[PDB]
Every structure is written in C-alpha cells, then in structure tokens.
Amino acid sequence: KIITDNAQRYALVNRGFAIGIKLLREVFDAIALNTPCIFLLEDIHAIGE
Amino acid sequence: VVVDTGVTEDDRLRASLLVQMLRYTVPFMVISGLFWMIHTWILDPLPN
C-alpha cells in the first residue's frame, strides 16, 4: 500500500505562525501506525529552502 | 466356498484410532487458540 501527499499543502503560515508544519508531524506519526507502507512526499523544496 | 467380509481387524483398529483422535481434537484446538492469542498479543506485536 502507498500513501502520497504534497508538501505545498503544509507551507501555510500566518502571523509568522506555520500551522501546517505540525500537521506534517501528525501525518508522520499516523504513517507510523499503518506498517508496512511507502510514504511519498513530493516537492520538498517548498519546506526546505 | 469361503464366505468373507471386509472388516478385518486392521480397519477396526484404525476406526478406533480415528475415534481417539476425534476425542482429543477439542482440547488441543483450545490450547492452540490460547497460545496464538497470547503470541499475537505480546510475544510478537506490531512494531510501533
């Protein structure tokens, strides 16, 4: 089974507060519950410049 | 003429053996179900 998600959906910031950047750790620790699995994450430069 | 049957002692002994296995089949399945409930729970859980 495979899980796919894009990174632009988590570069949401307002008032200097990045909301999605903990949404991401939440989805990570959810991936960690459905082993064995492949997690895709595309265009990481959106949160890696 | 020698009149015969087909129930020589061997098949009777094999039938009694089968009956004995049938008598044993239930407690063994009970203990196996228990062991595998335990092994699925603790001795071999999911990794995370």
What does this entry look like structurally?
This is part of a larger assembly, with chains A (49 residues) and B (48 residues). Chain A is an alpha+beta fold. Chain A contains one helix and four strands. In chain A, strand 2 (13-14) and strand 3 form a beta hairpin. The longest helix of chain A has 12 residues, at 20-31. The relative contact order of chain A is 0.33. By secondary structure, chain B is mainly alpha-helical. Chain B has one helix and no strands. Chain B has one helix at residues 9-43. The longest helix of chain B is centred in the middle third of the chain and has 35 residues, at 9-43. Chain B is rod-shaped, with a radius of gyration of 21 Å. Chain B starts with 8 loop residues before the first helix and ends in a 5-residue tail after the last helix. The PDB classes it as membrane protein. Keywords: ATP-motor, Ycf2, Fhl, membrane protein. The entry is titled "Cryo-EM structure of the Ycf2-FtsHi motor complex from Chlamydomonas reinhardtii in apo state". Chain A is Ycf2. Organism of A: Chlamydomonas reinhardtii.
